Design a protein around this nucleic acid. Structure first.
Lengths: 180, 94, 94
RNA sequence: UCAGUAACGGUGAAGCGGGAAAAGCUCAAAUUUGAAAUCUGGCAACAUUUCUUUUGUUGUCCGAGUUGUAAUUUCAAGAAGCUGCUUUGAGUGUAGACGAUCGGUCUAAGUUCCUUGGAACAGGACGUCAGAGAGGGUGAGAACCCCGUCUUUGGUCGAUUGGAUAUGCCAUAUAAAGCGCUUUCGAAGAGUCGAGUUGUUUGCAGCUCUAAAUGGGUGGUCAUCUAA
RNA sequence: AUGAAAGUGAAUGCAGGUGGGAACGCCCUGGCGUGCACCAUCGACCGACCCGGAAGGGUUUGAGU
RNA sequence: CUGCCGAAGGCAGAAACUCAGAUCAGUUUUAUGUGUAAAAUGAGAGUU
């Protein structure tokens, strides 16, 4: 059994046409939805930022948009993800805020901009999200002045201590519980 | 190419990557080296080997006397006071 | 300590208290289902091996009682879960 | 890609990472109890159609159904009060534009002269078209004889439609829904999980036995999921 | 890079010296410098092994700086 | 198809660099008893 790749240009052309057909069908709105900024879950990749599946309920509520209408206006919602730190919270919150600020909603039934809509909608144009919302990387630290207490601070001497504390943590954990 | 083979004449014949301090200044761009190396500035340049893809920094090479802050998870034993004798400090990143 | 190694190893950030997830709740004992479980209990009775445990406990041979209960169920935690329940029924009957 | 790595004794992954594509949901478990509000079928009209061939609407009768059909709820929650802001059609014709399917139909210029030859579609001379010098046929190598080819992501015919825009008519909201609070409760799947044993390549099956409700599963007291 | 593994994890001395050594230069054939690569030596450093409580001591070790 | 090199009962060739040598010899002399050592003749000899 062998799997040959003689249809690689054909697959590439078909995917491009499918993207083109998708764009033509839903032209008023961007062809890619808004995605949250999310950090990979490992020690090898926790220094980067990538695109998550969707926002969380806490982020949606903090931004002020309900989880019901969020799907309608094009904001994917993830019910599994949870925010364990405010740093991620206001990070995804400001992603939604800039999305909403740049967002224009065509009024339904074309009678009046009922509450949340756009008065002038003639400026419709299909633009990708990445241009308006360019996902970034972790902020690289710029040059800072020398810190004196850090200068006195050795470095890995500490990592040796808390390491030895960690390895023999059960050793003294026993010691206290047995003598108490 | 079959034509240049041997049978055409046989016819009928039957995770923790590491970096040494010699390469620490290489990580900073050319602009940072030009605007911080070899001169005396109150603010010191910072090197983040973690953002460059390095887990630990090891101790092979020398350094110019320009102070520099090294952000890393693990640091080598006498590489620390290699920074300190060079005038910089290793500030450990989490 | 904002450190890579230690009992509190890792980065230091502002921790947020997560909202309560409803699927974490399962296993709780509602008052209505507890009442209904009482009604079926008094209308159905107990299984044959339960009756043997009553006899064993009323004879006060608890070691054999827990041994046979573990043999019947399969796990010590289930055996203990039985024992406390049928002893709890015992003083109610008394 | 991890990776021919972990693992097993030659077999041989998966997590993470980068991409292609993205869309979420529905029940059982709670009383509508001031009202079975639900549904198939028979009969009679009204319709509508890719269609006299399709699909429905209303009225009436019988039946199903209280051993539970409707509405609300599915754990991301949710219900019950409380609150003051916001939102609303499972409709029916007319017109233009915007696409697409089917087939109908439209296309630029030598057959001029001399030699060879059965035949010129060959050679030479004099010319033309080209958004068309791809290909095929014609008595030998034909852009200009013919079909086609470019124009064509188009003009012209008709018949359909798919979605929107403008416009008209019906609907009935005495309602329904979203959001912030609780002085509230929060029902969640059993011969099923699980254990012992035998069999197959943890997973599955046979058999003995057989659960629980902050319980159960998974990973090294903690973390994460909520099966049958 | 080493270690069974946790792990640690490299120019002392021009990134160490000695001799040979290609080529080059200097004169005045040879001598002189000069020394690539490479080869003989050679000390240090990274470790695993041992002693010491990091310094220091081994003449053990790795197709190591 | 032609040419060149060419065995074996650890070989032949290829590449990388020594010394213009006393560097080797299916050899003969000289000395000590077929072994060893230090004149003849021939050859550019070699090392991983």
């Amino acid at each position: 059994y062998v799997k040959t790749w003689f249809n690689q240009p054909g697959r590439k052309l078909r995917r491009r046409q499918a993207r083109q057909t998708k764009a033509a069908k839903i032209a008023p709105r961007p062809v890619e939805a808004i995605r949250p900024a999310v950090k990979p879950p490992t020690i090898r990749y926790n220094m980067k930022v990538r695109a998550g599946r969707g926002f969380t309920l806490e982020e949606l509520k903090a931004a002020g948009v309900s989880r019901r209408v969020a799907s309608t206006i094009g904001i994917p919602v993830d019910h599994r993800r949870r925010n364990r730190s405010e740093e991620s919270l206001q990070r995804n919150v400001e992603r939604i805020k800039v999305y909403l600020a740049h967002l224009i909603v065509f009024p339904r039934k074309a009678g009046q901009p009922k509450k949340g809509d756009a008065t002038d909608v003639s400026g419709a144009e299909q633009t990708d999200v990445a241009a308006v919302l360019p996902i970034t990387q972790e902020a690289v630290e710029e040059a800072k002045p020398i810190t004196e207490e850090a200068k006195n601070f050795n470095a890995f001497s500490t990592l040796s201590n808390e390491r030895a504390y960690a390895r023999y943590a059960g050793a003294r954990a026993a010691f206290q519980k047995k003598r108490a | 190419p079959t034509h240049v083979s041997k049978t055409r004449k046989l016819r009928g014949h039957v995770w923790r990557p590491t970096v040494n301090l010699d390469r620490l200044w290489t990580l900073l761009p050319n602009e940072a080296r030009d605007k911080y190396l070899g001169k005396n500035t109150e603010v010191a340049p910072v090197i983040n080997v973690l953002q460059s893809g390095y887990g630990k920094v090891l101790g092979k090479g020398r350094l110019p006397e320009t102070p520099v802050i090294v952000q890393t998870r693990y640091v080598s034993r006498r590489a620390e006071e290699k920074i300190k004798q060079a005038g910089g400090v290793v500030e450990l990143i989490a | 300590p904002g450190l890579v190694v230690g009992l509190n190893k890792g980065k230091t950030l502002t921790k947020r208290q997560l909202p309560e997830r409803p699927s974490r709740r399962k296993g709780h004992l509602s008052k209505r289902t507890a009442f209904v479980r009482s009604i079926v209990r008094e209308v159905a009775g107990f299984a044959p091996y339960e009756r043997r445990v009553m006899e064993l406990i009323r004879n006060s041979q608890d070691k054999r009682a827990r041994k046979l209960a573990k043999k019947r169920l399969g796990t010590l935690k289930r055996a203990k879960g039985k024992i406390e329940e049928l002893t709890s029924v015992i003083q109610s009957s008394r």
